[PDB]
Amino acid sequence: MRLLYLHADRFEYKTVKPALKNPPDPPGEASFGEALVVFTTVEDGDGPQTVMYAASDIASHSSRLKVTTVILYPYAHLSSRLAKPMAAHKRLIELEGALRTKFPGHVHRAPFGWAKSFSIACKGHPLAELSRSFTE
Amino acid sequence: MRLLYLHADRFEYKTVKPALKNPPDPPGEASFGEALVVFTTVEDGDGPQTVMYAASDIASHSSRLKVTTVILYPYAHLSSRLAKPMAAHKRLIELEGALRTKFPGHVHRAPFGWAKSFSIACKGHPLAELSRSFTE
Numbered sequence: 091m092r093l094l095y096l097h098a099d100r101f102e103y104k105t106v107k108p109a110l111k112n113p114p115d116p117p118g119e120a121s122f123g124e125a126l127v128v129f130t131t132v133e134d135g136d137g138p139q140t141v142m143y144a145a146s147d148i149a150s151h152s153s154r155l156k157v158t159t160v161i162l163y164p165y166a167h168l169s170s171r172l173a174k175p176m177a178a179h180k181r182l183i184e185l186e187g188a189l190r191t192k193f194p195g196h197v198h199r200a201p202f203g204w205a206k207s208f209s210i211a212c213k214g215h216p217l218a219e220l221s222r223s224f225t226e
Numbered sequence: 227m228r229l230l231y232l233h234a235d236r237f238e239y240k241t242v243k244p245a246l247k248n249p250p251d252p253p254g255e256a257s258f259g260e261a262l263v264v265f266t267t268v269e270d271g272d273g274p275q276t277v278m279y280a281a282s283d284i285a286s287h288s289s290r291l292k293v294t295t296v297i298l299y300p301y302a303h304l305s306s307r308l309a310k311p312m313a314a315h316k317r318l319i320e321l322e323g324a325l326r327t328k329f330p331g332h333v334h335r336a337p338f339g340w341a342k343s344f345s346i347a348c349k350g351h352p353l354a355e356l357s358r359s360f361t362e
């Protein structure tokens with residue numbers, strides 16, 4: 091699993107056209123104030139252990155940043171060892187579930203399988219943009 | 227070299243604190259309309275050939291998208307095999323130079339070695355977010 095942690099002043103997205111033949115989530119849009127936006131690329135061989143490490147780290151980082159909102163944003167582009175779409179969707183659902191057991195704020199998982207437009211205003215402090223790798 | 231191609235409606239950045247002991251570029255800020263924003267991570271063993279392939283591909287993609295502005299945005303976070311900072315800065319300068327021989331529009335290379343704030347509004351079409359790897 092490869093993640094990018096963007097500490098944002100604001101974030102929004104809208105699904106546009108499907109990017110998979112049959113997207114497993116309905117279309118949607120959402121907008122947020124201050125949030126940790128987590129661009130999430132699920133990799134081949136990510137299992138439940140990987141999900142658990144990611145969730146713990148996101149919760150830990152969120153606490154450090156004093157953010158009360160995390161956006162789990164599926165992203166195909168952080169890796170060249172992607173898990174297949176249905177495995178990826180499952181791992182992202184697990185990640186959302188795991189994060190809720192560790193982090194007490196708003197957890198929003200953006201829909202999987204869509205092309206999206208988005209806007210972000212990313213903060214400029216030294217911890218505002220970090221990357222993470224998890225595996226098992 | 228690992229790149230992320232974001233086709234933006236708008237983009238802006240401001241340097242905040244230095245992220246290297248001695249940043250090789252002066253601080254600054256800039257804002258843009260429609261642009262191809264190229265998040266650029268220089269990797270160990272990127273040489274002139276790698277730069278040349280990247281430049282050709284950026285020019286090719288830009289032409290396809292009909293964009294007339296490219297932002298070369300140094301980014302430490304797309305890879306876990308980074309080139310050292312001074313090699314990275316040199317390769318980014320070369321990339322800017324090479325792109326100008328292949329692409330006729332505005333080429334802006336953002337300063338290297340700074341923490342930055344930024345905002346982007348990214349388009350939602352199927353070619354609006356792509357990743358690329360180049361090597362030699």
Ligand SMILES: C[C@@H](O)[C@H](N)C(=O)N[C@H]1[C@@H](O)[C@H](n2cnc3c(N)ncnc32)O[C@@H]1CO
Pocket residue numbers: 109110130131132133164165166167172173174175178201202203204205206207350355
């Ligand atoms: C395109 C861009 O605007 C958008 N934001 C996008 O990237 N959409 C991706 C993810 O939602 C998802 N997806 C497929 N495989 C994966 C994976 N292995 N890991 C995470 N997501 C995946 O399926 C879509 C097409 O790859």
Ligand SMILES: C[C@@H](O)[C@H](N)C(=O)N[C@H]1[C@@H](O)[C@H](n2cnc3c(N)ncnc32)O[C@@H]1CO
Pocket residue numbers: 214219245246266267268269300301302303308309310311314337338339340341342343
């Ligand atoms: C931090 C975030 O807000 C900002 N946008 C940032 O990432 N700053 C990076 C790049 O400008 C640059 N840098 C260092 N090594 C590299 C490299 N190998 N490839 C590209 N840039 C590098 O040095 C800064 C600190 O790593």
Ligand SMILES: [Mg+2]
Pocket residue numbers: 222223224
């Ligand atoms: Mg890790």
Ligand SMILES: [Mg+2]
Pocket residue numbers: 358359360
């Ligand atoms: Mg390539």
